[PDB]
Amino acid sequence: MAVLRQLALLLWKNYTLQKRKVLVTVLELFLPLLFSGILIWLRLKIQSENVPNATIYPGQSIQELPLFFTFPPPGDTWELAYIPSHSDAAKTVTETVRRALVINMRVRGFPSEKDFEDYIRYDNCSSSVLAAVVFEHPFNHSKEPLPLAVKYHLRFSYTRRNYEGWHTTSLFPLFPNPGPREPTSPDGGEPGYIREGFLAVQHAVDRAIMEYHADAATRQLFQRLTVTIKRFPYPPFIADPFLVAIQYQLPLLLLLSFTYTALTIARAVVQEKERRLKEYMRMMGLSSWLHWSAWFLLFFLFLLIAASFMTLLFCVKVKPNVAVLSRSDPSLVLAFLLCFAISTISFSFMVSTFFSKANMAAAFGGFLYFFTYIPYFFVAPRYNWMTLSQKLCSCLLSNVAMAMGAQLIGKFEAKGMGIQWRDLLSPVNVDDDFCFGQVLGMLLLDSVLYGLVTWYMEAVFPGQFGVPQPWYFFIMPSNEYFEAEPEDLVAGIKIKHLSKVFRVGNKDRAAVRDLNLNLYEGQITVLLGHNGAGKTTTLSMLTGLFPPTSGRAYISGYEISQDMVQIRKSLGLCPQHDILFDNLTVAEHLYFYAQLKGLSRQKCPEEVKQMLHIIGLEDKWNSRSRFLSGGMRRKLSIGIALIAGSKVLILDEPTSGMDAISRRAIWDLLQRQKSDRTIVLTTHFMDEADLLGDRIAIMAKGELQCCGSSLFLKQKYGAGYHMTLVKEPHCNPEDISQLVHHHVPNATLESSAGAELSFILPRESTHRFEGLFAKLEKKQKELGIASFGASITTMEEVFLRVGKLVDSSMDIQAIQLPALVKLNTGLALHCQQFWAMFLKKAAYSWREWKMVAAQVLVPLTCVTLALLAINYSSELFDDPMLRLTLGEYGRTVVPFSVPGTSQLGQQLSEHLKDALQAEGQEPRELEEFLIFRASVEGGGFNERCLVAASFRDVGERTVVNALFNNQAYHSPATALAVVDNLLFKLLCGPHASIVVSNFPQPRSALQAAKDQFNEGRKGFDIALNLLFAMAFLASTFSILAVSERAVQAKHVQFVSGVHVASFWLSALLWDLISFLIPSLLLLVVFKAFDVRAFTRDGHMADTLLLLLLYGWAIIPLMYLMNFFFLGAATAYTRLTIFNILSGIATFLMVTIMRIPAVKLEELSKTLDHVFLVLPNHCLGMAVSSFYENYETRRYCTSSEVAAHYCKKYNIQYQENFYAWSAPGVGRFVASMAASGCAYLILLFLIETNLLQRLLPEDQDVADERTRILAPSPDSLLHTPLIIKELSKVYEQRVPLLAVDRLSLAVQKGECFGLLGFNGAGKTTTFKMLTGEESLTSGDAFVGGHRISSDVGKVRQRIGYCPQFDALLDHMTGREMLVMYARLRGIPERHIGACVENTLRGLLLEPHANKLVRTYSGGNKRKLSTGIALIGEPAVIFLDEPSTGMDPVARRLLWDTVARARESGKAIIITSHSMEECEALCTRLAIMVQGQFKCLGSPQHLKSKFGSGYSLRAKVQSEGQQEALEEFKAFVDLTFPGSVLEDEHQGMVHYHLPGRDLSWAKVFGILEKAKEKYGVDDYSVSQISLEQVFLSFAHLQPP
């Protein structure tokens, strides 16, 4: 009904906010197309062969060795050794082999395999050995027969003779191409077994062993039987290699396509939680799921455009039968991409509930996307073994469930099916039960399994602002101080016996006890309250955050505990912060919030038009919410608070941090806008709580203390008036105090600061004021008084006294109210600043240990875990055993036919069936049977069927064809093995056996030294592995340098006088010291793994130099790149990426642009000269070229033959390791040492600023100006500030005279004011005095030193308190004071005392050692102004010293700032609150448009620019309908010129004109008329200082 209205109003907002960011939207649609258009290129760059049918092979003979051993070698005859020599049984078996393979072979005999293994490698004639028969029996030394169980080797050459090794390490090819292993070569192929002569020798040895036992039947049997060998015929096949590369490039190119729009979801979701906008909407009625639904319906509808396009350009027939995923039903591709999209949205929602900042979440949730894809590189190959449950459990990571589904799209596409909606359940081959339905299901299950984690972490760990819930929440289904309240007005908030008690003694909040307040309509009520006393528990119960305990409170006739859902209809409210979306207009916020508050669509626009008028923003309409102000945003927030008609209106601190005009505008707004509604303020200013507030309430200990109007409270909780004089040089305070006390008895000389003399005249003696003022009017010149005045108490005193009567804390008991050394210089200074700046940088590595566990632990793992995955070797082995017998594979299945008509087949088939070794028999009925079978079996044929048998006798001759599966390496031997194994049991007793082996010969000395030299795939692979771990380390140096400049902490330090060299050469020293712990922990790793290219010789001190030279060259480059960034976490992720692209990309763009005359690219010589300025490409190409030189040297040294080979082929190793033009690292050392010195120079040339330099004015102002041009002989020598004829002109397209001649002279014991209008130049004068800005035509003498010449000796004598908080969160309350006591001098023996007394002067001792992050927002303003006062400064430049502080702590600070001025200093305040420029000032100066318009103490200003008085009388309730006008007529008769100006329920407020009214006459008149006209109380006061300041408001140029 209306939920559907909110769900669309909340979706228009998201769509608008998101399409206003053009670079992100356009970059989210051009990644998933740039990454999927690559496949179109890669497909049109590859063709498919697709043989028709019928590839079959002929047969070979194994009777005689190939026609290569007929010719003898250069040298002698061939050799054939046997290893058991002493045994005669083996001695005679080899001789029949010799007389069966007659060439000239000489038979040798050896003791044992040790002797042969030493003969082959340690000789020069041991090169013509052909085979070597080895047995497995001790043989009972001299004579013994051969036991019927025989095993033996043959053992061999090592490299192909007739023509790589024998591949005994493996058993199937590692990278199987599609098709036959050797399409040509109809006899075996690569491993040998035919060309070499393995089979001929094996058959001969088998025949020898047969004749050794039969010798007679053998001749008969082999007279009518010969054995040949044939290869399987291979079926017609698809030859396309691209379909094999779709199972490793599709998943990665899908993930890399969605991985950006998967991290702009986390940022968008968390950025709106960080700004507390979701918390604001949740307090208007919107539930917490309306936001997730509106995020989902946007990002899903936005990913469905990319998925459709991706589906389209996968499956468009570019050319006849092309277009990757050619026959694959595009609807199913789309329906799989949509499930991937839902999963990758629901993943980001879950990720965004772990972070508070938007930068961190965006950076570190775009990384977990990748990090959840890793376990697929370890499942892509090992896929045929895994059981179903393990495969299904691996899918709980959505990025892996997608990849195992992108593999099936290749495994189906390489067969002709090409998934078609009707095989969702059918497995792939016949036996691997894992369909394509369990991919979609596991993709849509992880969505829910992630929703269940976000819904729990959003409710139990809400963050900093929300309120948590119990972890099991898914279980339960659930006096005389009070004035008389008005009678005309109707209550709009009624509270009765409200109460709340919190949890166990872990209080941490504030309790209310028995509140009985009451708030009325058409009236502003101000709710004050001391520090711990309720007042935010109360405003939380009323606004609906938690229920009460023992009370009830009605808002608009409802009750907060029963039906809050209807209260929130009229209750509008605006908080402390700002609730506005940047990138929406002024006109859109109102149209959004008016309707969200439940306003009809047809009747909205006129209220938007009216509210744009009430606020006063007709112009500046449809401006973004950025670019407005700081002072029209507080007006738009107030506008939102009361749009659509809202009765109750709870707004707090509405005028915080605003100048004095934008504050009166808001006051006037709120005064015109009540009239109908109840407003509840709460402020920290104690005159805003008085000027606009008609009824006030104060809470002290969770219990309402006093209530009533302002005049009611002031007459009850305050002392008398505040009469103030202005004494002159020839004056005596003693001669005036006698007058005052002798005339009025009770009084108090409150203070005599400056030249004021203020008293306290109690108000229970107002009948003597006639005499006092009449008498003191006369003796003006005789006494020395000029322009006195009087006023009544303030509201700060009332507030401070109420809480003092009913509290006992340490602070509130401190306030008092009226009752009832040579600084260092030269060398010590610089060496002291160096230490101070070194400790600051050092103490960050162990108070934030995320940088130690990421400088020491990331490089180590990144280097070891990826040396493991390479299997770094440094050693070579010698091709181990491989027993040639069926069974190392597994349970096979062996067919055999009997296409015979005669005998010699049946007995053989029965014996074969008696194998019972591996598989059964699987008899068939051959050549064509295999062709048919090898099309429906698929991969099963090449895993369960390796051999065959076919006994086809042509009458007498009985051939036995044995077939071998070429897809294996060692099949042609196993086939003959089984064939002759059974044919030997034929003419023997079947209790025997024959197995053999392969186990090739060991390498010689000259072969190992060449098979070790061809490990060139190690330098290039160990350089990339290290360049990738030095990019997660080089970036951690620009984090303190970014987060210190962003918080403005660097600006204050440079103002206080730190040197541009001590600042940076002290960061560099520590960043080099912190570049050895990893740089020395890498030697341990390279030693443990034994990487010899740089461990063996004195090279451990040559990698260390190469790593120090890289640290030295990249640290200063990472210092320069910090000037781009503002957040410490958007710089890490943008600088590691810069490192990786500057490194890997441009180092890999040179090695593979030099491939052995393939892609030519002779310009690599130019690229490797243009890339010599990047210090990552200079490390990669130095490590690689070190590892290469050492290898090619260690080779061309082992023997002379190698040296000759190197000479012929021009290998050119250098023996210096550091020379030029070589494999030596000379031009890389020399280019990293000269690049780290061209960055320091450029850093200092940026810091030291070599870019920006490559008319009746007033009587008192003129008096001041001409008092410092013609001074007394020594009138100005002991004074701090002597500004003289100071000016500054801009050149921004028009001469702007922002300062005009500014002649002033501040003295010891002063406190200058310097007020001004917005843009009057009060903020360039401040800068120009603190040394920041360029001067023009005039000087200033700060302490004795000119400000145009010696601007370095000045900065050591001035303190400076900024407006913002420029503190270093990793330091301590006391360490930050020690830092600044060192940057200024203060010999090391005094620092203890100078810090100890300051800390307890500001009352910071509890928090002295507390790590300034725990500090409340008001203990930071107490420390920023202890930093200003530490040391002995000549001048102090305070600037809004107490911004966000409550009244008690603010008073306690204004006290110290004045106790520091009593004892001979000079202060310069500059603030926006006119309440603070009176509590600590001695002389003021309003400044408009260029220059001073007035000057003098705040009383001399009120006399000279004041107008008159202001009455505030009230009349009792007796005849209020009759006495009010009777009094109101009298005050228009006896005071000609009054203005009524206000009226509220008992009271008036006049503006009695000051023309001809003494301070005596006005009191006599009212004191006589008090009783004759029935008045309850009254109070006369003079003009207010802020009202005097506002008089000059018309002098603004616009």
Ligand SMILES: CCCCCCCCCCCCCC(=O)OC[C@H](COP(=O)(O)OCC[N+](C)(C)C)OC(=O)CCCCCCCCCCCCC
């Ligand atoms: C498993 C399948 C799916 C899993 C996805 C869902 C699980 C997500 C877990 C990952 C996040 C772990 C929790 C986490 O990050 O804590 C938050 C802080 C960031 O703080 P921050 O963002 O300032 O605000 C805190 C948010 N709050 C209030 C809710 C705690 O976290 C940090 O501060 C970031 C940590 C700094 C980097 C760590 C580097 C130190 C050493 C590196 C580790 C060993 C080196 C090899």
Ligand SMILES: CCCCCCCCCCCCCC(=O)OC[C@H](COP(=O)(O)OCC[N+](C)(C)C)OC(=O)CCCCCCCCCCCCC
């Ligand atoms: C498209 C792919 C993009 C991703 C590619 C590579 C990006 C690397 C992801 C990790 C980035 C984490 C960023 C980070 O930790 O910030 C450095 C911290 C910030 O501390 P802090 O000053 O509290 O942060 C405030 C700044 N803020 C809010 C904007 C973050 O300052 C520190 O305290 C030092 C911590 C730095 C060490 C972080 C290194 C750990 C990364 C490896 C994590 C592996 C987990 C097993």
Ligand SMILES: *[C@@H]1O[C@H](CO)[C@@H](O)[C@H](O)[C@H]1NC(C)=O
């Ligand atoms: C080859 O070996 C024989 C002994 O077998 C030895 O006499 C001869 O010096 C060797 N030749 C060379 C070149 O070392």
Ligand SMILES: *[C@@H]1O[C@H](CO)[C@@H](O)[C@H](O)[C@H]1NC(C)=O
């Ligand atoms: C092998 O023959 C020897 C002949 O000297 C004899 O010790 C025994 O019969 C056999 N030895 C072993 C250890 O079986």
